[PDB]
Amino acid sequence: PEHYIKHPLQNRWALWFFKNDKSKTWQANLRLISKFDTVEDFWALYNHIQLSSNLMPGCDYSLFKDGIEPMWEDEKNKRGGRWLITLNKQQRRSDLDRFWLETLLCLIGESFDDYSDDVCGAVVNVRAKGDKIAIWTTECENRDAVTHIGRVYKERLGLPPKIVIGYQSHADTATKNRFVV
Protein backbone atom coordinates (compact mmCIF):
# COMPACT_ATOMS: atom_id res chain seq x y z
CA PRO A 1 0.00 0.00 0.00
CA GLU A 2 2.50 2.63 1.15
CA HIS A 3 4.81 1.89 -1.77
CA TYR A 4 2.48 3.04 -4.58
CA ILE A 5 -0.42 5.08 -3.09
CA LYS A 6 -0.42 8.87 -3.24
CA HIS A 7 -1.10 10.40 0.17
CA PRO A 8 -4.68 11.75 0.21
CA LEU A 9 -5.39 15.08 1.85
CA GLN A 10 -8.12 15.67 4.40
CA ASN A 11 -9.78 18.02 1.87
CA ARG A 12 -9.77 18.50 -1.88
CA TRP A 13 -8.58 22.02 -2.73
CA ALA A 14 -8.95 24.32 -5.72
CA LEU A 15 -6.39 26.93 -6.75
CA TRP A 16 -7.76 30.08 -8.39
CA PHE A 17 -5.96 32.85 -10.21
CA PHE A 18 -7.08 36.45 -10.60
CA LYS A 19 -5.66 38.88 -13.14
CA ASN A 20 -6.71 42.51 -13.05
CA ASP A 21 -8.21 43.32 -16.43
CA LYS A 22 -10.19 46.57 -16.53
CA SER A 23 -12.21 45.29 -19.49
CA LYS A 24 -13.79 42.75 -17.12
CA THR A 25 -15.87 42.52 -13.97
CA TRP A 26 -14.05 41.36 -10.85
CA GLN A 27 -15.96 38.06 -10.88
CA ALA A 28 -15.08 37.51 -14.56
CA ASN A 29 -11.39 37.97 -13.77
CA LEU A 30 -11.47 35.02 -11.36
CA ARG A 31 -10.47 31.68 -12.87
CA LEU A 32 -10.12 28.17 -11.51
CA ILE A 33 -6.70 26.71 -12.31
CA SER A 34 -6.95 23.17 -11.04
CA LYS A 35 -7.97 20.98 -8.15
CA PHE A 36 -5.93 18.43 -6.18
CA ASP A 37 -6.52 16.11 -3.26
CA THR A 38 -3.16 14.43 -2.55
CA VAL A 39 0.19 15.61 -1.22
CA GLU A 40 1.90 14.59 -4.48
CA ASP A 41 -0.63 16.45 -6.62
CA PHE A 42 -0.26 19.53 -4.45
CA TRP A 43 3.47 19.69 -5.10
CA ALA A 44 3.13 18.93 -8.82
CA LEU A 45 0.91 22.00 -9.08
CA TYR A 46 2.95 24.27 -6.77
CA ASN A 47 6.21 23.38 -8.58
CA HIS A 48 4.55 24.26 -11.90
CA ILE A 49 3.20 27.78 -11.32
CA GLN A 50 4.83 31.16 -10.72
CA LEU A 51 5.93 32.28 -7.28
CA SER A 52 3.70 34.96 -5.85
CA SER A 53 6.57 37.45 -5.94
CA ASN A 54 6.79 36.89 -9.73
CA LEU A 55 3.19 37.87 -10.48
CA MET A 56 2.34 41.12 -12.24
CA PRO A 57 0.87 43.61 -9.74
CA GLY A 58 -2.90 43.19 -9.68
CA CYS A 59 -2.92 39.38 -9.58
CA ASP A 60 -4.15 37.02 -6.87
CA TYR A 61 -3.85 33.37 -6.11
CA SER A 62 -6.57 31.77 -3.99
CA LEU A 63 -6.65 28.29 -2.44
CA PHE A 64 -10.09 27.26 -1.23
CA LYS A 65 -11.87 24.10 -0.16
CA ASP A 66 -13.47 22.32 -3.11
CA GLY A 67 -16.96 23.76 -3.39
CA ILE A 68 -16.18 27.15 -1.78
CA GLU A 69 -15.71 29.92 -4.25
CA PRO A 70 -13.00 32.55 -3.24
CA MET A 71 -15.50 35.41 -2.93
CA TRP A 72 -17.52 37.05 -0.15
CA GLU A 73 -20.75 36.04 -1.86
CA ASP A 74 -20.24 32.32 -1.27
CA GLU A 75 -22.57 30.89 1.34
CA LYS A 76 -19.52 29.70 3.32
CA ASN A 77 -17.90 33.16 3.14
CA LYS A 78 -20.91 35.56 3.48
CA ARG A 79 -20.83 35.53 7.28
CA GLY A 80 -17.07 35.06 7.66
CA GLY A 81 -13.94 37.15 7.63
CA ARG A 82 -10.21 36.94 7.29
CA TRP A 83 -6.93 36.94 9.19
CA LEU A 84 -4.96 39.58 7.31
CA ILE A 85 -1.17 39.76 6.94
CA THR A 86 -0.15 43.17 5.59
CA LEU A 87 3.29 43.19 3.93
CA ASN A 88 5.38 46.23 3.03
CA LYS A 89 6.99 46.60 -0.38
CA GLN A 90 10.36 45.34 0.93
CA GLN A 91 8.68 42.09 2.07
CA ARG A 92 7.70 41.05 -1.46
CA ARG A 93 11.32 39.88 -1.62
CA SER A 94 11.88 38.64 1.93
CA ASP A 95 8.61 37.13 3.15
CA LEU A 96 5.84 36.96 0.58
CA ASP A 97 6.66 33.59 -0.94
CA ARG A 98 7.66 31.85 2.30
CA PHE A 99 4.57 33.23 4.05
CA TRP A 100 2.29 32.09 1.23
CA LEU A 101 3.78 28.60 1.10
CA GLU A 102 3.46 28.36 4.88
CA THR A 103 -0.17 29.40 4.50
CA LEU A 104 -0.81 26.78 1.81
CA LEU A 105 0.54 24.14 4.18
CA CYS A 106 -1.52 25.39 7.12
CA LEU A 107 -4.63 24.74 5.01
CA ILE A 108 -3.83 21.42 3.35
CA GLY A 109 -2.30 19.99 6.47
CA GLU A 110 -5.36 21.03 8.54
CA SER A 111 -3.20 22.81 11.09
CA PHE A 112 -5.87 24.49 13.24
CA ASP A 113 -6.80 21.39 15.30
CA ASP A 114 -10.62 21.10 15.50
CA TYR A 115 -11.21 24.57 14.06
CA SER A 116 -9.72 23.68 10.66
CA ASP A 117 -13.32 23.01 9.67
CA ASP A 118 -13.86 26.76 10.11
CA VAL A 119 -11.25 27.53 7.40
CA CYS A 120 -12.54 28.32 3.90
CA GLY A 121 -9.29 29.16 2.12
CA ALA A 122 -6.48 31.66 1.67
CA VAL A 123 -5.78 34.54 -0.69
CA VAL A 124 -2.57 36.31 -1.63
CA ASN A 125 -2.91 39.78 -3.23
CA VAL A 126 0.14 40.95 -5.17
CA ARG A 127 -0.17 44.75 -5.13
CA ALA A 128 2.30 47.55 -5.83
CA LYS A 129 0.92 49.34 -2.77
CA GLY A 130 1.86 46.39 -0.55
CA ASP A 131 1.06 42.71 -0.75
CA LYS A 132 -1.49 40.89 1.42
CA ILE A 133 -2.00 37.29 2.51
CA ALA A 134 -5.17 36.23 4.28
CA ILE A 135 -6.86 33.13 5.72
CA TRP A 136 -10.62 33.22 5.26
CA THR A 137 -12.90 31.59 7.86
CA THR A 138 -16.57 30.89 7.70
CA GLU A 139 -18.07 32.74 10.66
CA CYS A 140 -16.71 36.00 12.06
CA GLU A 141 -18.79 35.55 15.23
CA ASN A 142 -17.16 32.24 16.29
CA ARG A 143 -14.78 33.86 18.77
CA ASP A 144 -12.94 30.75 19.87
CA ALA A 145 -12.50 29.29 16.39
CA VAL A 146 -11.29 32.59 14.91
CA THR A 147 -8.93 33.33 17.80
CA HIS A 148 -7.31 29.88 17.85
CA ILE A 149 -6.86 29.96 14.07
CA GLY A 150 -5.29 33.40 14.48
CA ARG A 151 -2.82 32.39 17.20
CA VAL A 152 -1.67 29.20 15.42
CA TYR A 153 -1.26 31.06 12.12
CA LYS A 154 0.78 33.84 13.69
CA GLU A 155 3.16 31.34 15.31
CA ARG A 156 3.47 29.23 12.15
CA LEU A 157 4.43 32.36 10.19
CA GLY A 158 6.99 33.13 12.90
CA LEU A 159 5.66 36.63 13.54
CA PRO A 160 7.10 38.16 16.75
CA PRO A 161 5.06 39.56 19.66
CA LYS A 162 6.06 43.02 18.38
CA ILE A 163 3.58 42.34 15.53
CA VAL A 164 -0.19 42.24 15.91
CA ILE A 165 -2.45 40.88 13.14
CA GLY A 166 -6.13 41.68 12.72
CA TYR A 167 -9.26 39.75 11.74
CA GLN A 168 -11.84 41.57 9.57
CA SER A 169 -15.37 40.45 8.73
CA HIS A 170 -16.19 40.27 5.02
CA ALA A 171 -19.39 42.18 5.77
CA ASP A 172 -17.21 45.08 6.94
CA THR A 173 -14.83 44.81 3.97
CA ALA A 174 -17.57 44.70 1.32
CA THR A 175 -18.71 48.20 2.28
CA LYS A 176 -12.17 47.56 11.49
CA ASN A 177 -10.61 44.59 13.24
CA ARG A 178 -12.92 42.33 15.21
CA PHE A 179 -10.05 40.45 16.81
CA VAL A 180 -6.31 40.89 17.17
CA VAL A 181 -3.62 38.37 18.12
Ligand X SMILES: C[n+]1cn([C@@H]2O[C@H](COP(=O)(O)OP(=O)(O)OP(=O)(O)OP(=O)(O)O)[C@@H](O)[C@H]2O)c2nc(N)[nH]c(=O)c21
Footprint on this chain of ligand X (rule: CB under 6 A): 26-27, 71-73, 125, 127, 129
Residue 159 — φ and ψ, nearest 5°? Answer: -75, 135
Compute the least distance from the CB of residue 5 to ligand X, in Å: 37
DSSP state letters, 149-170 = HHHHHHHHHT--TT---EEEEH
Of 7 and 19, which CB lies nearer to ligand X in the complex structure?
19
Compute the least distance from the CB of residue 133 to ligand X, in Å: 12
The partner residues of 131 in beta bridges, in order of sequence, read: none
Q: Which residue is nearest to ligand X, using beta carbons?
A: 71
Of 71 and 135, which CB lies nearer to ligand X in the complex structure?
71
129 is an annotated ligand-binding site residue: yes
Q: Tell me the CB-side half-sphere exposure of residue 178, using CA atoms within 13 A.
A: 20
Rounded Cα distance between 77 and 70, Å, is 8
Of 25 and 47, which CB lies nearer to ligand X in the complex structure?
25
First to last CA, the chain: 43
Residues placed in the known binding site for mRNA: 26-27, 72-73, 127-132, 175
Residues placed in the known binding site: 26-27, 72-73, 127-132, 175
